[PDB]
From a paper:
In response, one family of large bacteriophages uses a nucleus-like compartment to protect its replicating genomes by excluding host defence factors. Here we find that the bacteriophage nuclear shell assembles primarily from one protein, which we name [name] (ChmA). We find that the shell is primarily composed of a single protein, [name], which self-assembles through its extended N and C termini into a closed compartment.
Thus, together with our findings on 201phi2-1 and Goslar, these data show that despite extremely low sequence conservation, [name] proteins from divergent jumbo phages exhibit high structural conservation at both the level of an individual protomer and overall nuclear shell architecture.
Residue numbers in the entry:
A (entry chain C): 591 to 615
B (entry chain A): 64 to 586
C (entry chain B): 45 to 63
D (entry chain D): 626 to 631
Write the structure that this text describes.
Amino acid sequence: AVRGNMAARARGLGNISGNIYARSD
Amino acid sequence: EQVLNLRRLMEKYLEDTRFKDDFIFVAVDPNQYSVPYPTLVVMSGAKVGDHNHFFGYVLPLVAGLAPLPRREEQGPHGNILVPRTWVDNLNGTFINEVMAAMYAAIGGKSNGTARIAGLAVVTNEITAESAHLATTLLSAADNAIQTAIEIRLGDKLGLPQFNLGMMASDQPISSVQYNTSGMQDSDIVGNPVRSDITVTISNRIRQAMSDYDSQQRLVATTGYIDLTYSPQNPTFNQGPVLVNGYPVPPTVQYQPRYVMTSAYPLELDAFTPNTFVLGLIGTIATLNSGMAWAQSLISNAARGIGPHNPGALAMVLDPEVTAPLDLSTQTNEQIYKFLQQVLYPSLLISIDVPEEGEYSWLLRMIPAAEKIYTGKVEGEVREISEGYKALYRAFDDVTLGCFSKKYQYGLPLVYATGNRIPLGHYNHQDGHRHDIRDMDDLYMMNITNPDTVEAWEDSFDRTDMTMSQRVVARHEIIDRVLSGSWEQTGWAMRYDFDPLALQALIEAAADAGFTIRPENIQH
Amino acid sequence: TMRTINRTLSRRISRNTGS
Amino acid sequence: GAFNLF
């Protein structure tokens, strides 16, 4: 067979919305 | 004699306050009940209408007893011996005996109703000089009982719950600390917990006229970073792997993973699932602020050769290399460039759920939401389970009803990995006790031979292996590595979240008027 | 609002007491 | 089993 976990790659969180951060001034 | 001392200390502490008659203590011992260990039960009641409702907290004491032996099981090839711990002896008979004792304590079935609100095992001896531990246990039991009462009867008793609307007139902040040398965090019993990354969420206050500055700390979270083997197959005539719509170098074969180990309040008196959701939101927001999670590996690389050296990946990168590389003389950007060639630019969010402990009652909701649909016959639309409903309701209530508009009802929220993780501690060479969870993939790469690494990864990844086989393999590897000088205390299970659900939750929190300003992020 | 959260969501036994 | 104990 083939070693490794294939489902773990698809569950990664890449980026989130930028509106959660407080705006300067 | 452990039950008597603990009960005496609790009663002595309570004798001076105004809550003398609010608690009932029940002692259960094997000489009259079918229980494996001596236990103490702390009970409290609440009255709605003309009915009484009682809730109890169970505290078995196992200090001074012999450890459990191994059990022989049935396998595909033959018979295997599986290790066991204290929690394995708490079956339905124990629950029935505890319920019978609780009912006998209050007077009978006609005097009210009784339910179990939590369970925690105490592995340390209790003497006549342990007032602090007794006070902490009493506080934890009271918090659990009050939270259960609120959850069950808030609508009838008019008891509110935390939500993001109470932080509208203030400025939340966050901070992160990377520490890996010295003592670690401790639990209520006093056992070490791995605390490689610590995140604190606070609130900023300024006086209107006097211009004074102060802050209020709410909750804290601890965890660490692990690695998972996940090679990419280009030879199957498939498209290239895209992360955030960007291709990756062909040499990347490892996926970073974040594991949460604990969460506790700092100045808040009550800890509810809503507070846990707030802490999770804060941790997610902080950890993604400019790739701040790689700072842990960058800092770990500054120590040089050691069990946590990230330079062991040089052997993966080049087969000719046979020794870990030393990166203590490289700049931060050089280390980042080196890491970019072997690691995926993404993070996996996971959590360890203990089978028993101080906050197991709170954290048991995550496993309950893994099963979405009950197989009951339906007229038109399939029925949805109760744990999923509870988790969805908590998520929607924290964000004031925006999660429902952002996320579709019925989509997955939690996945199960199927790995059972042991809990314990061992003696470190620096004179302190360290968490048994220090043994990970990097430790095997830096300390052991590639065969052990392959066996560890196969045990963590193979799908044609039962739970007992994986447990036996990991136990054998740990015993061989540590020469048998360690102690086990319990079990834990690992679950991970859905990234789409997390993104929807972040968007809903942003849409509710909640913002956070990290204060410690560098570069 | 956040200043008196312990009054709104109170518990009988508190871990911290102060001097 | 512990999660469904009580």
